Amino acid sequence: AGEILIKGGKVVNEDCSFFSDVHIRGGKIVEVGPDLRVPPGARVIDATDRLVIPGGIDTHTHMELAFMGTRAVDDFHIGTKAALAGGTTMILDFVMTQKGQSLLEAYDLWRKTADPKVCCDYSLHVAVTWWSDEVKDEMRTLAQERGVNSFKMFMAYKGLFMLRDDELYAVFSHCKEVGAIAQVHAENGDLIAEGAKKMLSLGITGPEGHELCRPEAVEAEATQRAITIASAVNCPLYVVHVMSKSAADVVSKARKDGRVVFGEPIAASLGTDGTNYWHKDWAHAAQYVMGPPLRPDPSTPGYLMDLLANDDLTLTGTDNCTFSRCQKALGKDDFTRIPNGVNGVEDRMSVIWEKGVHSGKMDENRFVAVTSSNAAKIFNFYPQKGRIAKDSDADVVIWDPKTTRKISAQTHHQAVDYNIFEGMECHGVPVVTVSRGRVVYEEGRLKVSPGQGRFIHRQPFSEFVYKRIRQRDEVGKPAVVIREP
Ligand SMILES: [Zn+2]
Numbered sequence: 001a002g003e004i005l006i007k008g009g010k011v012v013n014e015d016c017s018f019f020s021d022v023h024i025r026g027g028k029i030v031e032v033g034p035d036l037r038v039p040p041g042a043r044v045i046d047a048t049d050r051l052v053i054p055g056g057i058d059t060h061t062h063m064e065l066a067f068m069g070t071r072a073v074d075d076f077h078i079g080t081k082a083a084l085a086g087g088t089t090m091i092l093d094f095v096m097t098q099k100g101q102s103l104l105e106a107y108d109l110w111r112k113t114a115d116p117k118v119c120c121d122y123s124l125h126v127a128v129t130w131w132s133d134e135v136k137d138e139m140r141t142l143a144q145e146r147g148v149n150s151f152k153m154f155m156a157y158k159g160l161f162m163l164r165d166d167e168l169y170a171v172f173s174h175c176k177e178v179g180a181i182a183q184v185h186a187e188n189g190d191l192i193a194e195g196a197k198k199m200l201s202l203g204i205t206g207p208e209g210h211e212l213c214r215p216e217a218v219e220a221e222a223t224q225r226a227i228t229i230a231s232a233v234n235c236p237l238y239v240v241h242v243m244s245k246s247a248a249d250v251v252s253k254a255r256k257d258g259r260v261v262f263g264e265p266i267a268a269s270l271g272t273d274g275t276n277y278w279h280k281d282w283a284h285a286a287q288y289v290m291g292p293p294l295r296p297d298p299s300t301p302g303y304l305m306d307l308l309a310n311d312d313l314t315l316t317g318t319d320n321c322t323f324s325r326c327q328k329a330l331g332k333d334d335f336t337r338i339p340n341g342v343n344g345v346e347d348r349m350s351v352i353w354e355k356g357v358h359s360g361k362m363d364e365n366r367f368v369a370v371t372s373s374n375a376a377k378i379f380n381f382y383p384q385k386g387r388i389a390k391d392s393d394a395d396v397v398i399w400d401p402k403t404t405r406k407i408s409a410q411t412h413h414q415a416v417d418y419n420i421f422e423g424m425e426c427h428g429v430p431v432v433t434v435s436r437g438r439v440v441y442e443e444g445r446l447k448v449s450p451g452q453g454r455f456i457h458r459q460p461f462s463e464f465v466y467k468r469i470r471q472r473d474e475v476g477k478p479a480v481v482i483r484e485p
Contacts, residue, residue, distance in 0.1 A: 002026055002437050005038050009047025009398065011388045013054075014369040022052055024394040027437040032390055045432055045439070047398045053368055054386045055089025055120075055395035055435065056349045057375035059264060060240055060317025063093055064113065067321065068339045070330070073415040074322040076117035077450045079345055082413040083120060084441045084448065086346035087430030089395035090121045090385060090456070092317070092375070094152055099130045099160065103138040107146055111455060118453035119446075120435045121395065123379065125150040125183060128171055129161040136174055143178040147457025149380055150181050150238070155222040156291060158189040168229050176235040176469065179460030181262075181378060183238045186222040186247065187214055187292050196336050207277040207285035210335040211293040216244035219292045223247040227254045227261050234472055236260040236465045238378065241319050243269045243292040245303045252312035260469055262378060263313040265304045267344035270316070271351035271421050273298050286328040287418050289338045290319060305355050308370055309362035315374035316352060318344025322416035342420050347407050349397070351421055353428025357401070364401070380462035394437035400429045413446065 004024040011020050011032065023031035023039075038044055064075035074082060076093075083091055093114065097106035103126055110124055126142055128135060128151045142148040153171055154161035163171060168184075175182040195213030199205075204212065223239055227250065230237035242248050242263045251263035274294035279285045288294055307313045321341025331338025344351075349371060356362045362370070368386070376386030383392050404427050409419040433441035440448040 001041060003039055003042035004045060004434065004437065004439070005036060005042050006045045006047050006052055006396065006398065007036070009050045009052040012051045012364045012368055013387055013389070014365055014373040017364060022388060022396065024396070024434065024437050027394055029388060029390055029392045029394050029396070032388060043439070045398060049400070050431060051364060051399040051401055052388060053397050053399050054372040054388060055397050055433065056087050057090040057092070057372040057385060058083060058088050058317050058320070058345055058348060059092050059315060059375045059379070060266060060319050061091040061093040061345060062096070062319070062321035062341065063091070065096060065321055067341065068337065070323065070327055070339050072322045072341060073324050073327070074320060074345065075415070076114045077119065078415045079320065080119040080122070080453060081446050081448060082346040084433045084435060085413040085430070085446055087349035087397040087399065087433060088345060089397070089433065089435045091345065092123050092125060092379060095124050095126045097127050097129050103128070103135060103142060107142060107148070115455060116451045119440065119448040119450060120453040121456055122453055123456040123458060124148055125152050127152040127161065129154065131163065131167045131171055139174060139180070140178050143180050143460045147455065149179060149458050149460045149462060150183055151175055152183040152185070152240070154185045154189070155226060156185055156187040156189040156192055158193045162189040165225070165229060168226070169233060172230050172235040173233045176233055179466060181236050181238050181462070181465050182230055183240050184226040186219060186226050186239055188218045188222045191218045200334065200336070205334050206282060207289050207335055207338065210289050210338070211274050211277045211296060214292060216246045216295055219244050220246035220250050223250040227259055230261065231259050234469055236469055238262045238264065240264050240317070241266045241269065241292065242304065242313060244295045245297065245300050248304055248307050248313060252307055255312065260465070262315065264315055264317055265308055265313050266316060267318045267348040267351050268294060268342045268420060269304055270301050270308070270355055271424065273300055282332065283325055283328070286331065286338050288342060288420055289328070289335065290321070290340045290342045301355065305359070305361050309356060309366060315370050315378065316348060318348050320345035322414060324417050343414055343416050346412055346414050347419070347421050349430060350405060350407065350426035350428045351424065353401065354424070354426035358427040377464035378462060380458040381456055394434055396434040397430050398432040400431050401427060403427070403429045405429050
């Protein structure tokens with residue numbers, strides 16, 4: 001039957017925690033309540049002294065992405081296995097359409113690659129890296145028929161993915177027309193371009209040049225510029241990988257001011273900092289290189305966790321885009337050629353629990369919100385996921401909040417041969433992972449088949465995202481002053 005009864009644990013949802021068993025049948029949670037009967041044949045997972053939580057949803061992955069001419073080593077198969085071993089049961093990955101390339105073709109190419117490989121459920125965002133009538137039509141089709149309500153735009157990567165303010169305005173207007181959320185990579189691409197060209201001319205070729213060429217003012221600027229353009233068209237906006245206190249503060253201010261904007265710090269920016277770029281060992285330093293960079297102010301990850309706790313920032317991904325040591329080494333003489341990207345998919349849940357909950361910054365319920373529920377709300381499949389409740393999908397993690405585990409490339413399940421959280425002792429261990437109603441990780445071991453996970457098709461106009469937008473369309477229309485002719 002695939003029947004499971006999770007007994008003896010404490011259920012933790014975004015709103016409150018309560019003791020109850022959870023009955024899973026055929027991919028679904030079919031009952032939640034105290035002292036449930038064990039149906040004959042059902043497997044019991046004993047969750048005594050464990051929390052029973054929705055599996056983590058990683059909003060931000062790049063599994064096997066061909067990026068700076070090379071291709072990330074964690075692929076859809078190993079990347080999703082690694083996510084499951086870390087208590088994460090869904091990933092949302094970016095279709096990185098090339099400039100001038102059909103968005104539908106790129107989407108089709110991602111689905112063909114991921115469908116036969118994923119070990120957990122997944123969905124997709126689609127990058128809008130150029131603009132034209134064809135792109136406009138394809139975005140409508142994706143939103144209405146292909147299950148995608150999130151488009152990603154770049155203010156960085158001049159020459160490559162970058163769009164100018166007038167194009168962002170049109171792109172954000174059309175996101176709003178098709179009921180999608182606009183995601184932005186917010187750094188000033190012109191400043192990055194000049195910055196790196198300047199660091200190199202000064203002989204600063206190492207990873208410190210990568211951070212110095214685009215300090216956090218560059219991120220904070222483009223963050224405010226994206227918010228202002230999105231506010232001008234009444235388009236909801238999502239700022240991916242918030243890396244710095246100053247860009248986080250921009251997002252915090254815009255929300256207090258009522259702007260429909262969501263900020264996403266990533267496990268990296270929550271669990272480590274950019275002082276690593278100044279490490280004497282070049283290889284160590286290079287491991288941390290990604291855009292935007294981690295910041296050398298050591299108060300940054302603690303500060304981003306505070307804003308995440310307070311909902312100035314709302315939910316988390318990893319930007320998992322991994323390159324091996326020999327791959328990073330492609331930039332040994334020039335930081336502009338180090339493939340950009342860090343790990344996280346596996347460790348996100350423990351890193352956040354240790355840095356956010358064990359530290360006293362947020363409670364276990366807020367932890368659920370910022371690791372699964374808010375992603376399900378924004379991308380439009382709550383309470384199908386992100387909630388332990390009857391009729392929800394059975395993606396469930398039995399969590400031990402008191403035990404610690406040390407993160408190490410020597411013990412992790414990612415394909416990458418290092419870990420930016422190397423050595424970190426985290427409270428918060430995923431002891432059992434359930435995905436689509438099957439036990440896929442227990443006693444330290446994975447049991448899953450590539451292609452077992454499914455693409456999740458979403459509808460447009462997520463209510464969490466759009467209900468205020470639509471009301472503002474109805475009452476916030478500018479009016480003419482009536483004057484004598
Ligand atoms: Zn990314």
